Symmetry: C5
Subunit: 347 residues, 5 copies
């Protein structure tokens, strides 16, 4: 994730110009290889046309260039690319909203799971750790960065997310399917045990805990669903072929022809297809942004900071339910007890 | 479902190029017959024009080719196809989200339906099986793959989803309408019996069970609604006719005319309508993706793995509420009891 | 509603071709009169131009035809029609989702309203009948088919949805506004009476009943709101005028001119405006689909089966809360008590 | 609001033609002045060109007309207008859904706030009146029609929505911000008093009342938010300037030039720019529909019937919670106690 | 925020014309510098072409102008800008809906946290202040205006949102991540203390408080998420480059060429590219509106009134839960105890 929200807080004269000088998370970083390859093939064709081909071969090549320039428009590149990129961007923001956060659960656990003794601390810390462990299991399932951090369950145990007893129980469970849900069932069992023990003082508090756990588990499941149900491979194939075929057609049809031949709209030889290069930049860049966003759990610059989120979620959850439990400042009268650096349209 | 999420985790130089070599779930698999038929009709017309027709018939055919090339644009193929495909894709993802999953219910049942004895196991297993049975009944109603797996209720009974006593009760119910809802009413009755028996310890836990059951039943009902209320047949007819009429017009108007006649934009005979074939590829491919996605419960490669989901849901539900009930590891102090391989914009 | 979900489960070679032979719910059924009228006016103009007008009148008519062909593009038909049809289709699916279904309520009532005696049966049947009666009142308010079935409240009483005592109470209520909500208030009162009587065993069950009743009543209200707040009449007028004006312009500008006059793009007289007819087919068909979908509660083929839904909802509700109450098969150990015909991306 | 849902229930031969004869809520009513002004300026320019200007001034004017006709396309009128109108229409339907309705609250109050005595009637009537008063305060804040009906709080007191004691409390509250929320806080306090008094029999019923009150208050707040956060003024300015500049360009570039000069596409003088007038009709009409819908709380024909809704909501709420409380017909066996004028795809 | 809802309540003859005279929140204010710079570069190029370049250099410049005019269309400016602006506007309204409001919480607190004594006042005021403090912490994290108002936590303490004891607890918490959530955990702890003390009278009221707190905290978290996950920098770079490259191309290709050279569509020298300036106005204005809306928490005229909202929320919350607690007017019979200045389609 490359944040630039601060840089664009106010609409200024050089508003988006200053963002063109960024390299991390940039279009240039994602596209310089493809742009160089396109320019290389174009210059190879241009050198062949200018120096290698005979006069008759040049006339045939010019006829082919005009044909491919005219009929390259029949490729619905804008049509297919717009649809695909809209679908990918919607999925991208939806997938970010699907990452499970323990904030709701840590508020509820701090409010509902009671006891200053070691057992109360154990209950609160274990509930938040089960939530974190479910998040880690699904994230290492769906995120290449989290997988590289946790390539085995041994790594997850060594990171403190899973104990060795919990590891024995987890691997002893006979299932061929993804086990990210297992800590959520542990959470439900532990919440029921805590309520039966009296650590949870009422049935409504237990109901709230289970509702927030189900929201968290739904988010983990939704991450699994987005990972499994890819954007239909046929859409990806079609848009990739559309871009490739259109730009091979442009490699042919955007060549500068000899202005001595008096071909219409062919009288200025600039030797470098500046607009064709800009059109490639924009269209191939759009597809590269979809390429980068299609799996936002990879290791691209604008991919989600999944490992940062794991560390932040674990630290904040443990702070919220252990350090901060029943740790209020004494109720003190505020500044305005005895009270800087629009009403409506029809009034 | 053909997953390729891993292959596109990072935006790489050969980003989407390597996905063009896939055959399962590909555009080539869905479109090679239609592409061959279009090319066959085009080559039949081309052979007739080149070898069969007389000179006067050739001049008339060339006038007709230019007319059909000019006025084939009056068919709003892009207009109708874009609308249709957007509607189908929205319905497709909505329909995937509508498939009932027992994860919420199995978390709640593991947390709320109590007893290590045989009767507690029976209650939890039976509640999850009623949920699974409702899912199976609606899925065999809406999915051709699940129907082929369960062509009779006898098959469902033999698969263990329905008992023989439950089969007698189910067929003895006098209703001409789809009975997928019957196990949900069984679930409500059984949850009430469990609460009255004391297996469910509080009224709030029963309320949570009934709320999650209603979410599950709503998902089953929504699957029935999507199966019943098709994309309006008039849209499907209109887009099919648009594609067919446009490409028959192109079969006429994209023919290569004799360059000796000096027709404008007709001076290069390539004998194979490469761009017209690419345009057919993209437009007919878009319609074929809508064709494949319009009923995502068929047996296409990118159709949902409904039978896999049935097996996974049943196995995971039975694991969650029977093997995993009250089966926590002893509460153990974690690694950070005494504590790898952004703050904001305005700071 | 014309369902064809089964016919398109798999993407086949003749995928959407076989749906072009359907007549019920077809574009041909909605559009053959308009297509015939357009063709009749076109042939009247063509016959006048070919046989009636003098040479000077023919030259003036040809100038007018070229003018109207050129400047008919200034009508934003695609612009206005796309916006309108998207709005109508969104409203159409939203309106289908707004039809009240008693499935949630019948699950809750079967789970919560207790007693095998006649009084328990009366309570459950009466609650589901109040829900059904609210649905019938709003549906006869908004649906022409349901109104034809229930043109008076006498018809509703004779159908068993309302008793005669309830009819006296209903007509004795002094209100000039639609009374579809009245049975929902009866439902709330009856649920409170049932809870006070002990038929509902707990306050949380009563709360769940009232929440599901409010969901049902919200759906009835939303149906009233969609019926009242039409698609803005100005949009309907604008799109109707756009289609009509554009196709009158085409009636003028698509005429085949005498090829002897050597007008550019006028040298092939086909005597039948095949593409213009296809363009009319697609554009007028799009507007006709919006026409049919704009009120999905009429008697069009693809309009909702409101009377079928009323009968199904009543029968299934009465089955669920009367026949099926506390009527479980004895808890029996399933087949897998002692256990046919993907893990993640990063693994 | 101009309802025409009934007129379009069935897709008929003269489907949308009969709606073109409506004047109330019509495009003609909103656009006849602008259309007359555009036609007046066009005819002034036409008369100047035909009668006033000299030959050289005519040649210069013809060059300018051709220039402005060619380059008027550079104005993205379709681009900006489509975006703006989609945003306005989405906000319009969202704003209609945001109008608070007391139906949920009146169902809950009839079910939960008990007592046939005068005090129970007072509690139910006062709770529904607080809801109605919050609706009236925000509506007179946001709606010009409701403001004209209630230009002072004295008017609201005289209408029975606020008592004089409540008026003293309301004006004695020291706040510079909109006080529409005040009756909602009164509602919360009164609901707590009713529960403490035993009129509300359980804590879950009080929780349901407060949840429905918060839904109602959220709707009032959302109306305030939509009134405050206008569609960004820069969008409105940009689209207004786009329409105005484009049609001034058309006032220049759509002039009929002397056909004797042999200008291409200028050989038929119709003296009335029929298509240009139709294009103005459609584009300016689209902007006028956005103009009318942008504040749907004004006094346009298709603006919401806010005063009708206030009267209906008050009357129906008072009927529901006072006349209809505990006023059921005796539980009577229905017609089908001893039982007119699709199963699935894969079956 | 520049509200103009009142000015457009009714669709009037001069409907949007009168909004073109506004300067605050206007397109002119955001765009006059860019428009002046574009016009300056254009006039520099025009002066060079008219006075400086030789005849041969003029002929080459004219060839380049025609080339750049023809092929500037290959830049998908409309394509990329439409996508970007739609994404930004959706995020903009979503971000406005994500600003936490204490209205739900103040209704619940006034209804549920009891006691007229000093301790009850302290509990209610402290709960609302914790909510306000969470809002302030996240807003100074995400909003430049709120940061300028609260550049240190010392400023927040001096404003009365945080006490000094709470400041000691807040800074003593060991966390490297944003601490906006801390007051929400304080809220959960304080609500639990209030329920345990008997100030909250029932467990369902505590559950409602925690649910509304979690809604509030979710809104604060969502503000953090929108601030962190910017619109992908690659989209911003691509659209900025598209606008810049297209308008540099227009700086070249929109130059008025010497009409003596008889270049087609170059025969009228207006010396000022009025349409090109209008096209720049619209396209650059669209991008400037996205620039202004992309971070709606800056100090632009149409940016959200975050400091006004902070002051309003604090004042209204303190009014609602302190002044207005248990402060009803005596239950009085309303005006219509003994009862001005549509039924349905199918009736
Ligand atoms: Ca990625
Ligand atoms: Ca399929
Ligand atoms: Ca209809
Ligand atoms: Ca209005
Ligand atoms: Ca800003």
């Amino acid at each position: 994730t490359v944040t630039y929200t601060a840089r664009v807080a106010n609409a200024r004269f050089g508003g988006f110009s200053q963002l063109l000088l960024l390299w991390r998370g940039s279009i240039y970083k994602l596209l310089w290889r493809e742009l160089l390859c396109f320019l290389g093939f174009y210059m190879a064709l241009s050198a062949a046309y200018r120096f290698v081909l005979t006069e008759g071969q040049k006339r045939y090549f010019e006829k082919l260039v005009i044909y491919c320039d005219q009929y390259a428009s029949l490729i619905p590149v804008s049509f297919v690319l717009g649809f695909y990129v809209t679908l990918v961007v919607n999925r991208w923001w939806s997938q970010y909203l699907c990452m499970p956060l323990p904030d709701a659960l840590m508020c509820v656990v701090a409010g509902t799971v009671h006891g200053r003794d070691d057992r109360g601390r154990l209950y609160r810390r274990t509930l938040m750790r089960y939530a974190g462990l479910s998040a880690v299991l699904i994230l290492r399932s769906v995120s290449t960065a989290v997988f590289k951090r946790f390539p085995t369950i041994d790594h997850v145990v060594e990171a403190g997310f899973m104990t060795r007893e919990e590891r024995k129980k987890f691997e002893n469970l006979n299932s061929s399917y993804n086990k990210y849900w297992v800590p959520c069932v542990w959470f439900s069992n532990l919440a029921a045990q805590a309520r039966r023990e009296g650590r949870i003082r009422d049935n409504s508090a237990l109901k709230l805990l289970l509702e927030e756990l189900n929201v968290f588990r739904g988010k983990c499941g939704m991450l699994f669903h987005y990972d499994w149900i890819s954007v239909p491979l046929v859409y990806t194939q079609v848009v990739t072929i559309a871009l490739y075929s259109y730009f091979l057609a442009c490699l042919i049809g955007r060549q500068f022809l000899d202005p001595a031949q008096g071909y219409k709209d062919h009288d200025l030889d600039l030797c470098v297809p500046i607009f064709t290069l800009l059109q490639f930049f924009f269209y191939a860049g759009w597809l590269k942004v979809a390429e980068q966003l299609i799996n936002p759990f990879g290791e691209d610059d604008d991919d989600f900071e999944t490992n940062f989120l794991i560390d932040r979620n674990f630290q904040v959850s443990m702070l919220a339910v252990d350090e901060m439990y029943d740790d209020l400042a004494v109720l003190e009268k505020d500044l305005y007890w005895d009270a800087y650096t629009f009403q409506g349209s029809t009034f």
